[PDB]
Design an enzyme around this catalytic site. Structure first.
Site, PDB file in Angstrom:
ATOM      1  N   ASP C  33      -7.062  -5.732  -2.888  1.00 30.85           N
ATOM      2  CA  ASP C  33      -8.165  -5.253  -3.471  1.00 30.85           C
ATOM      3  C   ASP C  33      -7.867  -5.496  -5.061  1.00 30.85           C
ATOM      4  O   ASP C  33      -8.606  -5.056  -6.063  1.00 30.85           O
ATOM      5  CB  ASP C  33      -8.309  -3.738  -3.365  1.00 30.85           C
ATOM      6  CG  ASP C  33      -9.705  -3.211  -4.241  1.00 30.85           C
ATOM      7  OD1 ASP C  33     -10.525  -3.798  -3.733  1.00 30.85           O
ATOM      8  OD2 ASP C  33      -9.455  -2.038  -4.792  1.00 30.85           O
TER       9      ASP C  33
HETATM   10 NA    NA Z   1     -11.908  -2.139  -4.043  1.00 32.67          NA
END
Ligand code: NA
Ligand code: HEM
Ligand code: HEM
Lengths: 489, 337, 79
Positions: C33
Site C-alpha cells: 500500500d
Molecule cells: Na491504501
C-alpha cells in the site's frame, strides 16, 4: 551570517520588501523556532532556494528572534515542540479537528499567528500543494473548498490573529543551576546545569544524578525569541536535545535522546545560588510504617525541618541542590506536608495503592532497522499508583496520585483476531522497565500474506504492592514506519 | 483476443497477452515519473493514451511500435495542472476528456483555480475546449453514444461536452437518506471497458440501528451503466471487510471486489456469491471479454488471473522487474485476431 | 487517533491504524500500500508524496518488496 543578510541575498529573490519595510508573507505570520525551520526547509526543498548550513541556521534563528511567539502563546501546545510521547492532540471543535488535525497535529496550527489574508494563502497552499487533499477521508464527504472559504479561513483569522512579536530574551543566562526531574523507565534525578556565554550562544553541560549513578553531557545551546531554549549535548556516542522554556531565570521543559525522541526526561532548573525553593521531592510518597529516604531537590533548603503530626524523621544531608531526608509516616493514608527551609514539601502516605494505571494507556511503536535507513520507534510505559481519594472513587477526576511503581511487564494479543495472527509473537517484546522494543521492518514471509511484524497488542503491568490485587493494561499498536517526519508533527 | 495494459513505475506501460499469460510489449516513456496513472486504449488495440508526469501530462503511444506519437503538457509556468484520476477517450476514439485541478503559481503564494474538464482532439492532440467542472471528481467516463461525459464526484455528474455544461446530478451523497447514512465512496480505478459499467463499492449504515452494533454497517454497490445512462445504488451485504475497487462482467450479472480478499456478487440478487483470500493486497479488478476470468492488479507488480466462477487462481503474470503498479489504472483491451 | 499524536486520522483505510481501530486492514504487507499512499499524496504527513513534494522519493525502488530498504525518511533524523 545574519538574518538580514539571508533575507536580502536569498529571500528577496522572490519575497518583496515593501516601502513599508515589511516582507511579503514573512511579516504576515508568527510561529515557533521549529515552525520557521519547517518553512525554510520547504523553501529550499520545494522552491529550490539554495542555503548553506550557516545561512539556513541564520535566517531560521533570525525569524525566531523577531517573529516568534510569547511563551504564553505556546501554552497547552508545548507537547508537540518537546516530542513528548505521552500527549493528546485535538482542535477546538469537531470541524477544526477533522479538517486540520487529520494529517498533522492540530498543534501545528495553534502554534501560529497570522493576518486573515495570510491564513487564506496558507489554506490555498494546502489545496495547491496537496490537490488530493479534498478527496481523502473527512474531506470528500463535504464541499471542502466551499467550507474552507466560508468557515475555516474566517475561523483561523478570527482565532489566531497576527498580534505582535514579543521582545527577544535580553539577559545573560550564564551560571550554575540546580535541576530536578524524571525520566520514565529509569526514575527520578537531580543534577546541575551550567551555562557559559560564547558569542550569542552558550556552552552547556548538564549532569544527571540518578540513585544508580550520574552522567554528564556537553554541547551548545541558545535562546530563541522570548524564551525558547534549544540545545544539543553529547557524551561519548550519545547525543541528546534540550527543548526548554526559559522564564524568570528558570528553565522548564523536556530533553530527549537525539536518536529516539520517545526516550527522554522532564525537568526544571534554577540558579544554584537562589533563595529557598523546592524543585521536587523523590519519592513523593511514603509507605506507612516504613522509614524511607527522600531527596528534596532545590536551592538553599538547608536543614530546618518542621514535620507534621503523623510523620517522624530527620535530615541526613544538605547542600548542592539537594537535602536528603529520612522520614517515616505512621498516620493514616493521605496527603502530608512539611517544611524545609521554610519551603513546603508535599508527600502522600499510604500502605497499598487502590489501583494502578498504565501511562500511556494508548500509544504506538514502529518497526525499523533490518537493513533499512529508518530505526525502530520504541514505546515507554510506566505503572502509576493511586488512591481512590475522598469520594470513594475507584477512578474519577478527584483522586490522589502515588507516582510510578516498579512492575512486571508483559505483552499479549489485544483480541481474538490478533491472537489468530499471533501478533504478540511477532510484534516485539517489553522488558522489565516497561520499555517496548518493536520488531524488524519489511515484509515477514513467515506470516500470512508475508505481512509486516506489526500487531494489535495489549500491555499489562503488575505492581507487587502487598494488600495485593494490583494490575493494569495499555493498548499498544505495533505499527509501520513513517517516511515523513518534521520538527513539529 | 484479450490484452491488458498495465502501467509499471516509473515510466512504463506493459501490454500483457492474457492468452499466453506473458508480457507482450514494454513501452517506455520519457519524462513520465514517478508513474503513469490513467491509461486508455483506442478501439482497435493499436493506439493508447496515458496520463503521466505526476498526472500533469499525457502521451499518445503506439502499442505495437512502442514509440511516443505525441504528448500534452497540461501545466504552464504560472499554472500547475493536475489530471489526477480523470482522463477518458471517447468511444469513437476522436476526443480525450481530461480533468484539470489547477493552481496558479504567484511569486510567493498559491491561488487555487476552479476545476475544469479539457477536451483534446485525439488525432492531433490539440486543446479544443475547456469548461468549468465540479470539484472532487475522480473518474471521467464517456456515455457509450459519446453524447455525455460523466464525472464521479460527491454526486454522479452528467456533463454535456458539446455545450461544456453540467446538465444533471445523479444522487450519491444523499442516496436514500431516510434509511442510510451518507455513502462513503473511494473510487479511483478506471476499469469499466469490458462491461460499459462504471462500478464502485460504497459504505454506509442503517440509520435505525445502534451505531455500536457491527450489523449496522452495510456494503453497497454503485453501478453507472454508460450505455443506458442509468446509475444504481443498492446494498449487497453486511460490511465485514473493505474492497478498494470492483469490475462488472460483460453480461452485467456479476461484480467482483478486491483488496485483501476477492469476492463475487450476484447483481441479480444483490448478494454475495463467494469470497477467497489473497496472497497480498490488490487494488484493481477487471473482467475478460468472455466473462470467465477476473484480473486483479495494482499495489505490487503482478497481475493475477482468477476463474470468475470458482474464484480459483488460474495464474499470474509478473511485470518486468516486479515494477509496482501502485494505484494506477489497469485496463483490458482487445485486438481482432 | 487523538492520543496518537503524529499519526493520521484519514482512514482510507489509514496508516498508523485502520478505520477499524486495528492494524489488520492496513495493507498486507504495508509495502503493498506504500506507493498507493505516496503517489497521490494521500497521507503527506506520514508518507512522502511523489505527486508534488517528493517526486523522486521512490527512485530505484520499483520493486517495492525487494527494494524497500532504499526508501529514506525525508527527515534527516532530529526532534
Ligand atoms: Na491504501
Ligand atoms: C528566504 C530563505 C525565504 C524565507 C524566509 C521565506 C519564507 C516564506 C514564508 C514564511 C512563506 C509562507 C508559507 C506559509 O504559507 O506558511 C513563503 C512562501 C513562499 N515562498 Fe518563500 N521564503 C524565502 C525564499 C523564497 C524564495 C527565494 C522563493 C522563490 C524561489 C520563495 C518562494 C515562495 C513561494 C512560491 C511561496 C508560496 C508557496 C509555499 O510554499 O508556501 N521563497 N516563504
Ligand atoms: C486545516 C485546514 C489545516 C490547517 C489550518 C493547516 C495548517 C498548516 C500550517 C500552519 C502548516 C505549516 C506551514 C508553514 O510553512 O508555516 C502546515 C503544514 C503542512 N500541512 Fe497543514 N493544515 C491543515 C490541514 C492539513 C491537511 C488536511 C493535510 C493533509 C492532506 C495537511 C498537510 C500538511 C503538510 C504535509 C504540511 C507540511 C508542508 C511542508 O512544509 O512541506 N494539512 N499546515
Amino acid at each position: 551570517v545574519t538574518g538580514e543578510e539571508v533575507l536580502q541575498n536569498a529571500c528577496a529573490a522572490c519575497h518583496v520588501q515593501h516601502e513599508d519595510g515589511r516582507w511579503e508573507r514573512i511579516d504576515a505570520a508568527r510561529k515557533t523556532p521549529e515552525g520557521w525551520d519547517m518553512t525554510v526547509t520547504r523553501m529550499m526543498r520545494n522552491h529550490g532556494v539554495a542555503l548553506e548550513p550557516e545561512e539556513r541556521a541564520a535566517i531560521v534563528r533570525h525569524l525566531s528572534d523577531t517573529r516568534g511567539l510569547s511563551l504564553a502563546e505556546t501554552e497547552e501546545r508545548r507537547y508537540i515542540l518537546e516530542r513528548e510521547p505521552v500527549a493528546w492532540d485535538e482542535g477546538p471543535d469537531t470541524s477544526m479537528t477533522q479538517t486540520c488535525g487529520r494529517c498533522h497535529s492540530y498543534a501545528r496550527v495553534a502554534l501560529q499567528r497570522r493576518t486573515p489574508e495570510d491564513w487564506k494563502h496558507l489554506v490555498n497552499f494546502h489545496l495547491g500543494q496537496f490537490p488530493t487533499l479534498e478527496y481523502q477521508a473527512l474531506a470528500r464527504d463535504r464541499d471542502w473548498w466551499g467550507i474552507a472559504q466560508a468557515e475555516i479561513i474566517p475561523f483561523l483569522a478570527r482565532t489566531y490573529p497576527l498580534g505582535e512579536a514579543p521582545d527577544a530574551y535580553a539577559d545573560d543566562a550564564s551560571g550554575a543551576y540546580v535541576l530536578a526531574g524524571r525520566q520514565p523507565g529509569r526514575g527520578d534525578y537531580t543534577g546541575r546545569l551550567v551555562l557559559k556565554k560564547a558569542g550569542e550562544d552558550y556552552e552547556v553541560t548538564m549532569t544527571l544524578d540518578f540513585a544508580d549513578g550520574s552522567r554528564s553531557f556537553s554541547g551548545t545551546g541558545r535562546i530563541l525569541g522570548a524564551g525558547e531554549w534549544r540545545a544539543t549535548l553529547s557524551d561519548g556516542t550519545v547525543t541528546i536535545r534540550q527543548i526548554f522554556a526559559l522564564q524568570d531565570g528558570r528553565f522548564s521543559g523536556r530533553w530527549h535522546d537525539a536518536d529516539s525522541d520517545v526516550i527522554g526526561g522532564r525537568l526544571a532548573a534554577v540558579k544554584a545560588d537562589a533563595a529557598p525553593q523546592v524543585l521536587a521531592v523523590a519519592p513523593a510518597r511514603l509507605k506507612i510504617g516504613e522509614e524511607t529516604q527522600l531527596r528534596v531537590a532545590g536551592t538553599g533548603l538547608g536543614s530546618d525541618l518542621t514535620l507534621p503530626e503523623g510523620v517522624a524523621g530527620s535530615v541526613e544531608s544538605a547542600g548542592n541542590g539537594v537535602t536528603v531526608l529520612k522520614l517515616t509516616a505512621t498516620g493514616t493514608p493521605g496527603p502530608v506536608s512539611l517544611e524545609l527551609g521554610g519551603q513546603k514539601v508535599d508527600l502522600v502516605a499510604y500502605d497499598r495503592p487502590d489501583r494502578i494505571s498504565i501511562v500511556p494507556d494508548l500509544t504506538i511503536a514502529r518497526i525499523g532497522g533490518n537493513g533499512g535507513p529508518i530505526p525502530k520507534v520504541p514505546a515507554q510505559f510506566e505503572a502509576m499508583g493511586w488512591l481512590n481519594g475522598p469520594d470513594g472513587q475507584p477512578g474519577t477526576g478527584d483522586d490522589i496520585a502515588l507516582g510510578a511503581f516498579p512492575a512486571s511487564w508483559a505483552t499479549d494479543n489485544f483480541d481474538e483476531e490478533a491472537e489468530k495472527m499471533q501478533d504478540a509473537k511477532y510484534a516485539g517484546s517489553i522488558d522489565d522497565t516497561g520499555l517496548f522494543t518493536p520488531a524488524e521492518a519489511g515484509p515477514n514471509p513467515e506470516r500470512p500474506m508475508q505481512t509486516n511484524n506489526a500487531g494489535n497488542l495489549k500491555v499489562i503491568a503488575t505492581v507487587d504492592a502487598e494488600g495485593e490485587p494490583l494490575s493494569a493494561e495499555a493498548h499498544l499498536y505495533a505499527t509501520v514506519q513513517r517516511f515523513v517526519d518534521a520538527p513539529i508533527r | 483476443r484479450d490484452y491488458i495494459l498495465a502501467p509499471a513505475r516509473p515510466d512504463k506501460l506493459v501490454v500483457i497477452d492474457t492468452e499466453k499469460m506473458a508480457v507482450d510489449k514494454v513501452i517506455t516513456i520519457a519524462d513520465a515519473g514517478p508513474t503513469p496513472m490513467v491509461p486508455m486504449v483506442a478501439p482497435g488495440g493499436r493506439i493508447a493514451y496515458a496520463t503521466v508526469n505526476k498526472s500533469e501530462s499525457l502521451v499518445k503511444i503506439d502499442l505495437v511500435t512502442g514509440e511516443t506519437l505525441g504528448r500534452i503538457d497540461l501545466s504552464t509556468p504560472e499554472e500547475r495542472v493536475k489530471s489526477l484520476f480523470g482522463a477518458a477517450l471517447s468511444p469513437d476514439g476522436k476526443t480525450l476528456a481530461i480533468y484539470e485541478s489547477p493552481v496558479r503559481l504567484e511569486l510567493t503564494h498559491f491561488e487555487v483555480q476552479p476545476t475544469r474538464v479539457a477536451l483534446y482532439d485525439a488525432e492531433t492532440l490539440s486543446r479544443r475546449k475547456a469548461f468549468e467542472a465540479p470539484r472532487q471528481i475522480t473518474m471521467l467516463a464517456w456515455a457509450r453514444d459519446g453524447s455525455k461525459l460523466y464525472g464521479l464526484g460527491r454526486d454522479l455528474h452528467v456533463m454535456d461536452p458539446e455545450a461544456g455544461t453540467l446538465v444533471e446530478d445523479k444522487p450519491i451523497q444523499s442516496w436514500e437518506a431516510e434509511t442510510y447514512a451518507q455513502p462513503d465512496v473511494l473510487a479511483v480505478w478506471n476499469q469499466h471497458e469490458s462491461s460499459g459499467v462504471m462500478a464502485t463499492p460504497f459504505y454506509t449504515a442503517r440509520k435505525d440501528i445502534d451505531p455500536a452494533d457491527p450489523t449496522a454497517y452495510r456494503t453497497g454497490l454503485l453501478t453507472m451503466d454508460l450505455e443506458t445512462g442509468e446509475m444504481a445504488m443498492r446494498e449487497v451485504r453486511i460490511m465485514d471487510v473493505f474492497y478498494f475497487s470492483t469490475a462488472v462482467n460483460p453480461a452485467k450479472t456479476r461484480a467482483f471486489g478486491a483488496y485483501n480478499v476477492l469476492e463475487s456478487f450476484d447483481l441479480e440478487k444483490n448478494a454475495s456469491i463467494k469470497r477467497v483470500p489473497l496472497p497480498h493486497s490488490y487494488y484493481s479488478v477487471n473482467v475478460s471479454t468472455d466473462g470467465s476470468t477476473v484480473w486483479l492488479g495494482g499495489a505490487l507488480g503482478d497481475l493475477a488471473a482468477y476463474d470468475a466462477e470458482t474464484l480459483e487462481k488460474k495464474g499470474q503474470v509478473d511485470l518486468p522487474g516486479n515494477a509496482s503498479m501502485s494505484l494506477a489504472s489497469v485496463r483490458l483491451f482487445t485486438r481482432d485476431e | 487517533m487523538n492520543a496518537l499524536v503524529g499519526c493520521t486520522t484519514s482512514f482510507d483505510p489509514g496508516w498508523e491504524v485502520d478505520a477499524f481501530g486495528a492494524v489488520s486492514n492496513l495493507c498486507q504487507p504495508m509495502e503493498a500500500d506504500l506507493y498507493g499512499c505516496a503517489d497521490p499524496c494521500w497521507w503527506p504527513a506520514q508518507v512522502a508524496d511523489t505527486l508534488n513534494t517528493y517526486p523522486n522519493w521512490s527512485a530505484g525502488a520499483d520493486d517495492v518488496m525487494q527494494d524497500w530498504r532504499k526508501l529514506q525518511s525525508v527527515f534527516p533524523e532530529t526532534k
